[PDB]
C-alpha cells in the first residue's frame, strides 16, 4: 500500500531517489532513502546541560 500511494504521487516506488552532493554537485553513487520522518525535539537541551 505504501508503494501504491508512492506511485500515485509519481515518486519512485523503492522510496530511494538519487541525490547530488550539495558541495561538489556530483551524484552520490547509490540511490538514497529520502522521505519525511517526524522528528521530535526532546527536553534535553544543551543550554541546560553546559
Amino acid at each position: 500500500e505504501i508503494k501504491e500511494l508512492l506511485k500515485l504521487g509519481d515518486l519512485p516506488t523503492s522510496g530511494q531517489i538519487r541525490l547530488y552532493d550539495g558541495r561538489t554537485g556530483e551524484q552520490f553513487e547509490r540511490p538514497v532513502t529520502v522521505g519525511y520522518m517526524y522528528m521530535l525535539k526532546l527536553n534535553h537541551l544543551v543550554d541546560d546541560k553546559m
Binding site: Y36, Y38, L40, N43
Partner: protein
C-alpha cells in the same frame, strides 16, 4: 501534525485537557486570540438561559518543565461547531491532533 500517524492523536489531544473542546454545539459568535464565544444552537440550550458559551483560552503560562502552555483558537469567526469539536489547539496539538 504527523504526516504519518496512527489514529490515536485525536484521542490523546482531546482526552488530555490541553485543548478547548466545545461543550455544546453552535456557531462561533466571536473568536479572538484569548477567547471564543459560541452561540449555542437552540436545540442544545436550556430554557431560561443566555445560550452562549465563553471559552477563555490560556496564553503563555508555565508548565512544570518551564515550557509554555499556550492555546490558540482553532476555529474562525461565524463557523458552525458541534459538541465535541476542538475550538482551541493547546500546546503540541494541530487542529485537535496531537503533534509533538
Amino acid at each position: 501534525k504527523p504526516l504519518v500517524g496512527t489514529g490515536m492523536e485525536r484521542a490523546v489531544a482531546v482526552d488530555s485537557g490541553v485543548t478547548a473542546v466545545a461543550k455544546r454545539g453552535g456557531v462561533v459568535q466571536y473568536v479572538d486570540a484569548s477567547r471564543i464565544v459560541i452561540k449555542v444552537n437552540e436545540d442544545e440550550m436550556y430554557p431560561g438561559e443566555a445560550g452562549i458559551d465563553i471559552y477563555n483560552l490560556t496564553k503563555y503560562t508555565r508548565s512544570n518543565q518551564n515550557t509554555c502552555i499556550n492555546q490558540m483558537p482553532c476555529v474562525s469567526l461565524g463557523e458552525p461547531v458541534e459538541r465535541g469539536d476542538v475550538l482551541a489547539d493547546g500546546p503540541s496539538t494541530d487542529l485537535g491532533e496531537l503533534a509533538l
